[PDB]
Motif scaffolding. Sequence first.
Motif, PDB file in Angstrom:
ATOM      1  N   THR A  66       0.823  -1.194   0.000  1.00 25.45           N
ATOM      2  CA  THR A  66       0.000   0.000   0.000  1.00 25.45           C
ATOM      3  C   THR A  66       0.864   1.254   0.000  1.00 25.45           C
ATOM      4  O   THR A  66       1.941   1.273   0.602  1.00 25.45           O
ATOM      5  N   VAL A  71      -2.057   6.880   1.734  1.00 25.45           N
ATOM      6  CA  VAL A  71      -3.443   6.465   1.610  1.00 25.45           C
ATOM      7  C   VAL A  71      -3.821   5.631   2.825  1.00 25.45           C
ATOM      8  O   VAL A  71      -2.983   4.993   3.467  1.00 25.45           O
ATOM      9  N   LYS A  72      -5.110   5.643   3.153  1.00 25.85           N
ATOM     10  CA  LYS A  72      -5.654   4.854   4.248  1.00 25.85           C
ATOM     11  C   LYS A  72      -6.738   3.936   3.712  1.00 25.85           C
ATOM     12  O   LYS A  72      -7.647   4.386   3.008  1.00 25.85           O
ATOM     13  N   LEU A  73      -6.643   2.660   4.047  1.00 33.77           N
ATOM     14  CA  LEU A  73      -7.602   1.677   3.593  1.00 33.77           C
ATOM     15  C   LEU A  73      -8.412   1.139   4.764  1.00 33.77           C
ATOM     16  O   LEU A  73      -7.926   1.105   5.898  1.00 33.77           O
ATOM     17  N   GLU A 120     -13.318  -1.618  -1.294  1.00 35.86           N
ATOM     18  CA  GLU A 120     -12.385  -0.515  -1.128  1.00 35.86           C
ATOM     19  C   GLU A 120     -10.995  -1.009  -0.759  1.00 35.86           C
ATOM     20  O   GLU A 120      -9.996  -0.432  -1.197  1.00 35.86           O
TER      21      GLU A 120
END
Lengths: 51, 67
Positions: A37, A41-43, A51
């Motif tokens: 990742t 960014v944040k998942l 998502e």
Amino acid sequence: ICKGNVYAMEINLQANLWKSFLYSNVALYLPDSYKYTPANVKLPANTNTYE
Amino acid sequence: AAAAMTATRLASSYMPSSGSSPSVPSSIIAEEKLLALLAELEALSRQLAALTQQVSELREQQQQQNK
């Protein structure tokens, strides 16, 4: 008057198509362990979510 | 009415929320020994507290005798 051959850029057409087909396909369908990742960014924590 | 019907179906699932919802691994054998450990380990804490008073009482008894 140009004075020289015409300016021109170069692109390996056939190789790009082969790579792009290889990436939309299996390259994106590897198991998640091969995936990483980006930093900014944040998942969501859930693993089964789209998502 | 159906919005309620799907809401309870969504709420009744393994990982229902897009938020924090991962799985957890564990072993039943290790947990049972841990649960038994905390029972004896806690009992030692209170017993050792009780033994402190007996020694505390013993110390004051000697001082009273040697007052």
